[PDB]
Design a protein around this ligand. Structure first.
Ligand code: HEM
Ligand code: HEM
Lengths: 363, 362
């Protein structure tokens, strides 16, 4: 497939097929003027319609008046749409502007402090996010660079993260990706095909309390560093006991195949799968949509690598919070550290050509 | 997803078609034992033969003794070779160790200071490098991680650079990629099929004065920050005048097609193409093989963006140095800053299964 439709009851980039690459950006708002911000949301929506179809923004990247800057910065000319999706979300800090304080959803809860948190304030929070997913990373970067340019004077970029999953040209669609610890990652997840499970666990409903959010969802982002060089010194048995699945096949202990249902009593009590499973958490179930990262090496020569964890849910209080609380004693905690965090309310979809991002909130 | 052959008279990853992704690492040596360093070069060569064919290193990623760490870290299981190449180079600082002082090639020149340089010493230099290029970033990270692990106690990573997309071409028959300024980059390079031009401008020859380097090359690496706020407010005419080519087609000024030959006298006297062209530099010609990068935000509300510039040449003194000296008046200097630098001697190819990286030096 080459393009993903932009219009719908829901924003694309949640339940639509998982693309190979991510560019995730958090923005802070610099204007106090509600009218100026609405004008920007309409201009951004018009740009997103062009970008997700493989077209340049505005009048184009070349062929305009020579004495004017081009409307599009030009680095995606000649590339394909690449399944680009652009998903916008609103942080709790936006609701302190524009008279919105009584329209913050109760489901957009502030996260508690969790044991072992080491959060960098500069790579946490944000008034707004745009999640750009595509199979070509230059298509994703071009989208973020041009939205930031259109918004200059009204928004600034607070923090940015590049990520990667599978490379689809060489890797079959059905094959579970491996994370940078070398384990299969995504076996037991909500799939975009499971319409009733998305209604139960992912999409906000009208009766949940906040009518503007009907058909939206709630996003938790966590930048999780892995202690790669410590993990690589652990024995094979220590690594498998941390998860409760074997490394080669990814089967649950005492089973033969990856997709065999787990028997939780055969795993160690503090194994990651046993603690995270819905049966250990009162039925709490998440849509995981995260990406691996490798940013470089730190000052000590260690690899700056890990998982940029993204979870979508109907209510932060009944999805991420109870599951992450249950990981207080996870055997995996020896090898990871949460170093960035943010939460966002992801509004409903853009219904047609005349609609715009945030129209249910702003009017 | 196909394999690139590892053995040859030359190392792969130079004339080879340019792959989508880069992971570049520079290492410093921490052992004084020559025999221990030779043992590492042989173990690294054996690992490279496995990794470039899509196999796990050593005894594999699982199914060994439960109480031992796996020989391979496992995150490339089930992936194709993805055109992985692994290219090793030796920095000038290596030749102060192991009694190698008299074997440093004359062509491995230290670079002069250039006007506008702001070089970070921590992300410059290095005793040696490994260039990993592949179409899958996970395959490239797995290769660098496993080499670093094998080298524990003998080498440490000094600095690394990931490139998310290529800004170079050795295949003129395929689409030329764009850099983050929005211009095609790679039109007039050296192609992998141009055997005469590779022998003249890229490969070191026995007669050049350093027999152990015959069939090798010399690498310059420059980390270049781009002033994208400043560039994005420039007019279309300003952008095109900086280069001497139009933005949409990438043709030389006045001409209709990308690959039409430049007419230099129609360009501004400070245009990048006019100053960099071989005819402006006594014939000096380079093989360019760079990649784009973005390392987050700059903490001032903007995306960080740059180009990791890589050039291969027969002699640094006759390749990169004269061309970069001629760029002192380039219109492009308003929009870039060099912030990292390193040079390396890239030895000849691994001839067969009994040969090893660096065997002609050691
Ligand atoms: C670097 C951090 C992490 C790594 C490497 C990791 C790895 C894994 C692996 C290998 C599995 C098993 C295969 C699968 O079903 O996907 C798994 C399952 C799971 N993980 Fe994690 N995980 C991490 C962080 C988290 C966090 C922060 C949460 C939630 C707060 C979470 C929730 C889950 C859930 C819900 C499952 C599925 C359990 C089931 O229903 O069987 N993980 N994870
Ligand atoms: C961020 C930095 C740079 C950018 C954005 C850039 C961009 C370009 C562009 C757009 C072209 C024209 C198309 C092509 O033939 O490749 C070009 C050509 C060229 N560049 Fe650069 N360049 C940069 C740095 C450098 C450096 C540092 C050198 C060498 C010291 C260099 C050497 C060349 C050469 C030799 C040509 C081909 C000229 C010819 O024979 O026609 N460039 N560059």
């Amino acid at each position: 497939g080459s393009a993903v439709p932009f219009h719908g009851a829901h924003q694309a980039g949640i339940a639509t097929p998982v693309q190979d690459r991510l560019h995730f950006a958090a923005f802070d708002v610099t204007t106090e003027d509600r009218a100026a911000f609405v004008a920007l949301l309409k201009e951004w929506t018009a740009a997103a319609r062009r970008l997700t179809a493989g077209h340049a923004v505005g009048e184009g990247a070349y062929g305009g008046l020579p004495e004017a800057p081009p409307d599009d910065t030009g680095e995606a000319l000649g590339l394909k749409p690449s399944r680009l999706t652009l998903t916008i979300g609103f942080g709790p800090s936006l609701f302190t502007r524009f008279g919105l304080a009584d329209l913050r959803p109760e489901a957009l809860a502030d996260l508690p402090k969790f044991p072992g948190d080491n959060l960098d304030r500069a790579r946490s929070g944000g008034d707004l996010c745009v999640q750009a997913c595509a199979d070509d990373p230059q298509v994703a970067v071009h989208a973020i660079r041009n939205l930031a340019r259109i918004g200059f004077g009204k928004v600034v970029v607070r923090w940015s993260q590049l990520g990667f999953g599978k490379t689809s040209s060489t890797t079959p669609d059905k094959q579970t990706p491996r994370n940078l610890l070398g384990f299969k990652d995504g076996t037991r997840n909500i799939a975009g095909t499971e319409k009733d499970r998305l209604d139960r666990f992912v999409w906000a409903a009208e009766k949940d309390g906040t009518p503007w959010m009907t058909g939206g969802s709630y996003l938790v982002a966590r930048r999780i560093r892995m202690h790669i060089e410590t993990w690589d010194r652990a024995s094979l048995q220590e690594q498998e006991d941390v998860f409760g699945r074997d490394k080669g096949e990814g089967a649950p202990v005492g089973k033969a195949k990856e997709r065999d249902e787990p028997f939780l009593k055969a795993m160690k009590p503090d194994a990651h799968v046993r603690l995270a499973h819905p049966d250990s958490n009162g039925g709490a179930t998440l849509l995981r949509r995260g990406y691996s990262f490798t940013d470089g090496t730190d000052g000590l020569g260690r690899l700056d690598a890990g998982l940029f964890f993204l979870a979508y849910q109907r209510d932060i209080r009944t999805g991420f919070v109870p599951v992450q609380r249950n990981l207080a004693t996870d055997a995996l905690n020896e090898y990871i550290q949460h170093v960035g965090s943010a939460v966002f309310a992801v509004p409903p979809g853009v219904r047609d050509a005349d609609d715009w991002w945030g129209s249910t909130l702003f009017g």
